Design a protein around this ligand. Structure first.
Ligand SMILES: Nc1nc2ccc(Cl)cc2s1
Ligand SMILES: Nc1nc2ccc(Cl)cc2s1
Length: 115
């Protein structure tokens, strides 16, 4: 509360560390369904069903332009990619499987780096 703070966690490296994690996502061989925005004109239903589209290149652009206030807002966008994927894709598809794999991959890098 006012004049009462927890000890200050060092957050000066967070921007750089998030960039590294994102680089490792981008270079994963199962990254291909998530590298660019889903084409809202060539995929029937996507625009209407998925209210908040997100993809790695958009995350990269937001990261590089100071649009994430903190660590956590970055992780929310990453998770949004895989939540969107689960909403639109059957678990038993290549894209469905890519999503589960990538989420797992992310959550480990996340835990190892910050938790
Ligand atoms: N991340 C992605 N989600 C979808 C959903 C449908 C189709 Cl056709 C492609 C893709 S790529
Ligand atoms: N950004 C991407 N959009 C699509 C849409 C359809 C298929 Cl099959 C793959 C991809 S990757």
């Amino acid at each position: 509360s006012m004049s009462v703070k927890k000890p200050k966690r060092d957050d000066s490296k967070d921007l750089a560390l998030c960039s590294m994690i994102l680089t490792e996502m981008e270079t994963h061989e199962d990254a291909w369904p998530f590298l660019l925005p889903v084409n809202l004109k060539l995929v029937p239903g996507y625009k209407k069903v998925i209210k908040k589209p997100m993809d790695f290149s958009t995350i990269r652009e937001k990261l590089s332009s100071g649009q994430y206030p903190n660590l956590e807002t970055f992780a929310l966008d990453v998770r949004l990619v895989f939540d969107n994927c689960e909403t639109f894709n059957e678990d038993d598809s290549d894209i469905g499987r890519a999503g589960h794999n990538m989420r797992k991959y992310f959550e480990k890098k996340w835990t190892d780096t910050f938790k």
